[PDB]
Design a protein around this nucleic acid. Structure first.
Lengths: 50, 100, 278
RNA sequence: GCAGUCUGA
DNA sequence: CGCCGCGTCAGACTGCA
DNA sequence: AGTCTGACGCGGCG
């Protein structure tokens, strides 16, 4: 819901979902760039944690 | 509703961490090692093949590289939720229950 | 940068190892003898087929005639160190080919899929045995390093249980024999050479994983300066790292440069373009 | 929408 | 040793994405 | 991830 001050009142899910959608998207980068394993490991673990 | 196509598989935390762990109880593999697998702190061989590696055996980081030198590609091990998904999809339900 | 040289020499050792291991396949000779003739018929080009040797197409003609003459003497060495001296001679001329990346990639994934060809059988037979036999598997290792074409009567009660699957086992022997004859080589030798190339690539990747932590300094320092372009530090480090990875496989380490001094030429390429994308 | 505090029965 | 719970209702006021 | 953090509870239970 948009608030009076302009800063929207947000449920936490819209952040948590956002927190997922970044990292998954980020992972979608590395599967295309053929990144090394030591990087995509950290990225997959961050995705799982999110 | 919507859906996000996860770029990689991902373990559901409700079946992994709610005690008793359903994932662990189904795989007969203790929870403390499954956490190490699907958080990329260890490996697990999805198949040993012609190699002295049990299908539930966990390996640490350098042991995977070491077991490479000893057996090459005879066995196959992964880490993360892909490995647990493989171990799950690989098992035979009715055969396992008739054996147990 | 002496650690860089220690790493790079083991890298080149691994790539020499995978080169001489893939060189043992005789059908690769037929493949390249088709390839060079596609080039000579103006339907292919050598600059996409071979980068150099260990450029002129006449020396390539000489080398490919040598490889053809070596393939015929590979044919007549049916006799088993008699084949071993010839296959070492074939590796001698094969290791003199600085093949184009994509062609060598085709070769190595061809070896991978032909290894998988026997892999499927070696797996499925095991999943047929391990369900019902409770078998002397520790000795199935020996039984399969040998090759059920002779082993039926294993003189135990489970020697009856193998009769439940024996038909599918013999079907698996038929498929194993057809794949064994298709390659013109013993399956065990293929297992060994594929193990060898796997170990070469594993050692190279090992040294790569030491190198990436060895060279975090340059990417950290460049990303720390590039923070202010409208991005976080934590993804500019990714751009610099993947740029470093692109710099790895194309670094002529004998040039005397520090490898870091090379990666920036692509790190700037990797970050300033990524800021364009995000 | 939530948190914190105070208060009432 | 980690995890699960620890009364109901109401009013007021701040502060905050 | 550095905090110039907290913890500053208990009781039962698997």
């Amino acid at each position: 819901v948009p608030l009076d001050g302009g800063r929207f009142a947000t449920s936490d899910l819209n952040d948590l979902y956002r927190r997922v959608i970044n990292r998954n998207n980020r992972l979608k980068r590395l599967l295309d760039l053929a990144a090394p394993d030591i990087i995509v490991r950290n990225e997959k673990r961050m995705l799982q944690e999110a | 509703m919507g859906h996000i196509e996860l770029a990689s598989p991902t373990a559901h935390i409700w079946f992994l961490k709610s005690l008793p762990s359903r994932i662990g109880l189904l795989l007969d593999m203790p929870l403390r090692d499954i956490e190490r697998v699907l958080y990329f702190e260890s490996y697990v061989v999805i198949e040993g093949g012609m190699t002295n590696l049990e299908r539930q055996q966990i390996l640490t980081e350098e042991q995977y590289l070491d077991a490479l030198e000893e057996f090459g590609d005879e066995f196959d091990a992964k880490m993360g939720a892909e490995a647990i998904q493989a171990l799950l999809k690989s098992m035979d339900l009715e055969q396992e229950c008739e054996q147990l | 940068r002496e650690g860089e040289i220690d790493i790079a020499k083991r890298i080149e050792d691994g790539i020499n190892q995978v080169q001489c291991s893939v060189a043992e396949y005789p059908e690769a000779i037929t493949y390249l003898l088709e390839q060079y003739d596609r080039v000579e018929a103006e339907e292919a080009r050598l600059s996409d087929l071979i980068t150099g040797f260990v450029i002129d197409p006449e020396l390539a003609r000489e080398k490919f005639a040598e490889l053809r003459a070596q393939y015929v003497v590979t044919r007549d060495t049916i006799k088993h160190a008699t084949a071993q001296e010839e296959i070492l001679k074939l590796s001698e001329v094969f290791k003199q080919f600085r093949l184009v990346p994509k062609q060598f990639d085709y070769l190595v994934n061809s070896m991978r899929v032909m290894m998988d060809r026997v892999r499927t059988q070696e797996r499925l037979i095991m999943k047929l045995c391990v369900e019902q036999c409770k078998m002397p598997k520790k000795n199935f290792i020996t039984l399969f390093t040998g090759n059920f074409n002779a082993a039926i009567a294993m003189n135990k009660p489970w020697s009856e249980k193998l009769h439940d699957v024996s038909e599918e086992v013999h079907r698996a022997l038929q498929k194993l024999q057809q794949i064994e004859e298709e390659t013109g080589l013993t399956i065990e030798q293929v297992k060994d050479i594929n193990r060898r190339m796997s170990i070469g690539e594993a050692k190279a990747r090992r040294a790569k994983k030491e190198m990436v932590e060895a060279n975090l300094r340059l990417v950290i320092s460049i990303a720390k300066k590039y923070t202010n372009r409208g991005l976080q530090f934590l993804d500019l480090i990714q751009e610099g790292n993947i740029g470093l990875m692109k710099a790895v496989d194309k670094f002529e380490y004998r040039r005397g440069y520090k490898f870091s001094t090379y990666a920036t030429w692509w790190i700037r390429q990797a970050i300033t373009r990524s800021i364009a994308d995000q």
